[PDB]
Amino acid sequence: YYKGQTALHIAIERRNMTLVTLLVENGADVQAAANGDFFKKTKGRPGFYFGELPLSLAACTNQLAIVKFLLQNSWQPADISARDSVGNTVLHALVEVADNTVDNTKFVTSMYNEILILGAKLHPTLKLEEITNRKGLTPLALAASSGKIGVLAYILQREIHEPECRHLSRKFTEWAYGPVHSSLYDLSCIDTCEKNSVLEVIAYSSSETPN
Amino acid sequence: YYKGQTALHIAIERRNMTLVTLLVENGADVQAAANGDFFKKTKGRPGFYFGELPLSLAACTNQLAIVKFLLQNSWQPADISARDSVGNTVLHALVEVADNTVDNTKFVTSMYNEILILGAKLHPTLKLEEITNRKGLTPLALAASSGKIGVLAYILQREIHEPECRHLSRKFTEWAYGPVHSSLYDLSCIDTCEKNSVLEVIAYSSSETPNRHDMLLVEPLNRLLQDKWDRFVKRIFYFNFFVYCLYMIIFTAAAYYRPVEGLPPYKLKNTVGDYFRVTGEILSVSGGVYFFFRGIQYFLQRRPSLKSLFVDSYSEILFFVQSLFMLVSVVLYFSQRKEYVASMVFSLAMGWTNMLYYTRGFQQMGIYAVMIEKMILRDLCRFMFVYLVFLFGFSTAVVTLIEDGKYNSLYSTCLELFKFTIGMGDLEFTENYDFKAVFIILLLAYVILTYILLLNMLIALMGETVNKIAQESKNIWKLQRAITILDTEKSFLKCMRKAFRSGKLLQVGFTPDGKDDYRWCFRVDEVNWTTW
Amino acid sequence: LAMGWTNMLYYTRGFQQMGIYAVMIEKMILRDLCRFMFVYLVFLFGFSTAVVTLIEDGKYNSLYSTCLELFKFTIGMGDLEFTENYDFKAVFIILLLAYVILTYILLLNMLIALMGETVNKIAQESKNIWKLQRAI
Numbered sequence: 005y006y007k008g009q010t011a012l013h014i015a016i017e018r019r020n021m022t023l024v025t026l027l028v029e030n031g032a033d034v035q036a037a038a039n040g041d042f043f044k045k046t047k048g049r050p051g052f053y054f055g056e057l058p059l060s061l062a063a064c065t066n067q068l069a070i071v072k073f074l075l076q077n078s079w080q081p082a083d084i085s086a087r088d089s090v091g092n093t094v095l096h097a098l099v100e101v102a103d104n105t106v107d108n109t110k111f112v113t114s115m116y117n118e119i120l121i122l123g124a125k126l127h128p129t130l131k132l133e134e135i136t137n138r139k140g141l142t143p144l145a146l147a148a149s150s151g152k153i154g155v156l157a158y159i160l161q162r163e164i165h166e167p168e169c170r171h172l173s174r175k176f177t178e179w180a181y182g183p184v185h186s187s188l189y190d191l192s193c194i195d196t197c198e199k200n201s202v203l204e205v206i207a208y209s210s211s212e213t214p215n
Numbered sequence: 216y217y218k219g220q221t222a223l224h225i226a227i228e229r230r231n232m233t234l235v236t237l238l239v240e241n242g243a244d245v246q247a248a249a250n251g252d253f254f255k256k257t258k259g260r261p262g263f264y265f266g267e268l269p270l271s272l273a274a275c276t277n278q279l280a281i282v283k284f285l286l287q288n289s290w291q292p293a294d295i296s297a298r299d300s301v302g303n304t305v306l307h308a309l310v311e312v313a314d315n316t317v318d319n320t321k322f323v324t325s326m327y328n329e330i331l332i333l334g335a336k337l338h339p340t341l342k343l344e345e346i347t348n349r350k351g352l353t354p355l356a357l358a359a360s361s362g363k364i365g366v367l368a369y370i371l372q373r374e375i376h377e378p379e380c381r382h383l384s385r386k387f388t389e390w391a392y393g394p395v396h397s398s399l400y401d402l403s404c405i406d407t408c409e410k411n412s413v414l415e416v417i418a419y420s421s422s423e424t425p426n427r428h429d430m431l432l433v434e435p436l437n438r439l440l441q442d443k444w445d446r447f448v449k450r451i452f453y454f455n456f457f458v459y460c461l462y463m464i465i466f467t468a469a470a471y472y473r474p475v476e477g478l479p480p481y482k483l484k485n486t487v488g489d490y491f492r493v494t495g496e497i498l499s500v501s502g503g504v505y506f507f508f509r510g511i512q513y514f515l516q517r518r519p520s521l522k523s524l525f526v527d528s529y530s531e532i533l534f535f536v537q538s539l540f541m542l543v544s545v546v547l548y549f550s551q552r553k554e555y556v557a558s559m560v561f562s563l564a565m566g567w568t569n570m571l572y573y574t575r576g577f578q579q580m581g582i583y584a585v586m587i588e589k590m591i592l593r594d595l596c597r598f599m600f601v602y603l604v605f606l607f608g609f610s611t612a613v614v615t616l617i618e619d620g621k622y623n624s625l626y627s628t629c630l631e632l633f634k635f636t637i638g639m640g641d642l643e644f645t646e647n648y649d650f651k652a653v654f655i656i657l658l659l660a661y662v663i664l665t666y667i668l669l670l671n672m673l674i675a676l677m678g679e680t681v682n683k684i685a686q687e688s689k690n691i692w693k694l695q696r697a698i699t700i701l702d703t704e705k706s707f708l709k710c711m712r713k714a715f716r717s718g719k720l721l722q723v724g725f726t727p728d729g730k731d732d733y734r735w736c737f738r739v740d741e742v743n744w745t746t747w
Numbered sequence: 748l749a750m751g752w753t754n755m756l757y758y759t760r761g762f763q764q765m766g767i768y769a770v771m772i773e774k775m776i777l778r779d780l781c782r783f784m785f786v787y788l789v790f791l792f793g794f795s796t797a798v799v800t801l802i803e804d805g806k807y808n809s810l811y812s813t814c815l816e817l818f819k820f821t822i823g824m825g826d827l828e829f830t831e832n833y834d835f836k837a838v839f840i841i842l843l844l845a846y847v848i849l850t851y852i853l854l855l856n857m858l859i860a861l862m863g864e865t866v867n868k869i870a871q872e873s874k875n876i877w878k879l880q881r882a883i
């Protein structure tokens with residue numbers, strides 16, 4: 005029941021950069037999705053969710069160099085806004101794979117920051133986070149609903165200290181006089197949105213939410 | 216009494232490699248055993264057990280190089296399967312010498328791994344662990360019986376990462392995709408063996424075993440118990456609970472409607488109510504007899520030591536006592552006596568209060584019942600002797616003071632004094648005496664002393680155990696559930712080998728011999744994002 | 748009317764201390780009451796059935812009245828001599844004393860258990876639940 009599995013996914017899993025480069029040299033496809041039951045969310049206790057796309061698999065598997073190579077290859081550019089069958093993008097997969105652990109939390113936030121920066125640089129004209137899946141949940145909304153404390157904590161306090169990407173960050177410093185400095189937090193789609201707000205989602209979530 | 220001691224043993228003890236080589240150059244014997252009393256297990260507090268063989272002495276004494284030299288010498292090869300007088304081999308000695316300490320545990324597991332690897336390489340055709348001593352206990356069985364947590368934990372999770380010896384390891388990795396990889400555990404001689412299984416040995420071991428409670432924290436054991444439970448023991452246990460509840464309801468109904476004419480037995484009238492009463496009484500007596508017979512069977516099968524009779528088997532003894540009360544009740548009932556009422560009410564109260572045995576199977580209620588058991592065992596007598604001394608002394612004093620009247624008897628005064636403990640004291644319950652000052656002082660002193668007594672009671676049993684109850688009660692409950700599971704499995708063999716441990720798997724496919732093997736694995740899944 | 752008056756506690760949220768108090772009451776009523784009441788009811792019903800079986804006849808021969816009298820021991824109003832229409836006073840006294848001792852032991856492990864397992868969590872968990880309540 006592994007239908008949809010491709011050798012590219014296997015190569016990416018094995019952390020083989022050179023072998024991946026050789027495989028994609030001939031023109032290996034990158035938008036192919038693995039619809040096999042083994043790659044589904046929770047059908048059967050065994051399994052592993054990675055977004056059903058090779059780029060998402062690389063992102064979730066601690067391979068930043070492979071992600072960069074896939075995104076900025078000269079053979080076939082890799083789409084970053086691609087939405088799989090369940091409507092989950094790279095950010096959604098990163099949210100899913102988190103388990104609210106210090107090491108995993110740091111890993112996931114670092115990978116999220118890197119992928120967001122790369123997406124902003126590649127296609128600044130495209131808004132990335134605002135997108136929604138078939139469930140109609142934004143990555144922040146998904147993180148809040150699933151109780152991923154680390155991801156939500158990072159997103160609500162994003163701060164980028166390099167030029168041309170400050171607009172992505174949600175935290176800004178109005179000024180800093182002496183030892184006291186004021187800070188600004190972005191409240192977009194937080195309290196009132198008419199579809200799904202973070203406060204509304206967290207408030208009405210069932211107790212099954214971990215935290 | 217050092218008879219059997221040889222200079223080779225002394226040389227090995229002194230950690231002298233060169234001197235040992237010189238001694239064995241002339242052809243020093245290696246299979247000689249030291250049968251002197253000094254080398255025995257526990258004859259006299261001084262001593263040291265090392266397996267009674269020089270190779271075992273070297274193995275237990277932190278000399279791996281000497282062990283290798285002895286095993287692979289060109290003068291006289293050293294036998295590794297040699298069994299001493301008590302039937303203990305190298306592995307048995309390694310199990311014995313462990314004291315369940317982190318450093319000693321690491322030492323013993325490392326030495327066990329090295330000796331096992333060497334034995335496998337030297338004579339791969341020979342199975343080593345499966346052997347048994349005169350007691351008929353395998354090294355794993357011996358470790359489980361003696362409560363050596365470290366050795367058992369290592370053995371149940373053995374993993375060898377070099378070729379030609381993977382078959383020795385008990386843990387295998389079926390595959391590893393991304394950050395999630397499945398694992399397989401070997402269940403050979405673990406749950407059912409017909410001679411001695413690890414679960415059977417640990418379950419029925421007496422409380423003298425150092426660490427019986429926490430040994431079930433081992434991953435394969437815990438997961439296997441949970442799986443067996445959720446597979447069939449939950450349903451069997453619920454059915455048993457329902458049947459027992461119906462029994463108790465029927466018994467209560469039969470007893471409540473007992474006739475009042477005197478001088479039993481009573482002729483049964485031709486009425487529906489009489490028929491129902493008679494059938495209920497018959498069912499109650501039958502259940503009592505069944506409980507009595509099950510209790511006798513258990514007592515013969517296990518044979519407690521008469522010292523752990525109460526700490527262990529606390530529920531079987533209570534059920535047996537209830538059945539004994541029922542039998543005495545019926546015996547008196549047919550003997551034309553009116554004390555069957557007393558015996559029956561005692562049995563009925565015991566039966567209703569024994570419904571707590573079925574709380575196990577629910578975590579919270581099980582922990583609650585376990586705490587009740589622990590108190591009734593190890594606090595009630597100690598905290599009741601003092602209170603009874605105080606009560607009896609003050610009651611004797613007061614009754615001595617009283618001149619005459621209703622309360623001049625000791626029993627009535629004891630009852631009145633005890634009434635102060637349940638919040639119903641009087642302080643003026645009599646006036647037939649002299650020296651009201653003395654009476655008031657006695658009563659006030661008694662009240663103050665008993666209140667102080669209860670206050671230190673609660674302070675003591677709160678301070679000394681507010682921390683242990685965090686997990687010790689849960690561990691005891693898990694042990695209790697394990698006992699229940701094993702008893703249910705063994706008792707209900709009528710369904711043949713229904714709901715076996717797990718499926719059949721081929722982990723390695725080929726052993727050093729061309730023949731294939733299977734090890735009745737138990738699939739387990741885990742995730743480890745870090746440390747790939 | 749009783750339910751309405753006792754539901755005024757819903758408005759305690761909005762004051763930190765009273766809110767935490769009401770939250771603790773809620774947590775107990777949810778996750779401890781049934782578990783710690785099943786055992787007590789089993790004990791009470793069993794001993795009441797025993798005593799009523801022992802009694803021959805009279806006012807207290809009914810199960811309900813005997814259950815009420817036995818329960819009166821828990822609120823500090825037991826009698827230990829509430830009836831005399833029976834036989835074998837030794838058995839009656841033993842039953843009542845055993846019931847009293849068992850129920851006192853039961854309450855003592857109640858308090859020990861729910862104190863030991865949560866003396867630390869209540870430091871901040873109740874405050875967090877109250878903050879969630881206020882957010883709702």
Ligand SMILES: CCCCCCCCCCCCCC(=O)OC[C@@H](O)COP(=O)(O)O
Pocket residue numbers: 529530531533561564565568569570571572573584587588591841845
């Ligand atoms: C002459 C004998 C005096 C006792 C007369 C009848 C009253 C005895 C009441 C029961 C005494 C034992 C107290 C007790 O702890 O039982 C409650 C059970 O949960 C104990 O655990 P389990 O479920 O029976 O295994």
Ligand SMILES: CCCCCCCCCCCCCC(=O)OC[C@@H](O)COP(=O)(O)O
Pocket residue numbers: 749750753754755756757758769772773776
């Ligand atoms: C047949 C029904 C039996 C009950 C008859 C009426 C007596 C019921 C008394 C209230 C029972 C619920 C106990 C309780 O906990 O309520 C107190 C409130 O602070 C609970 O929190 P909240 O403010 O109502 O949200």
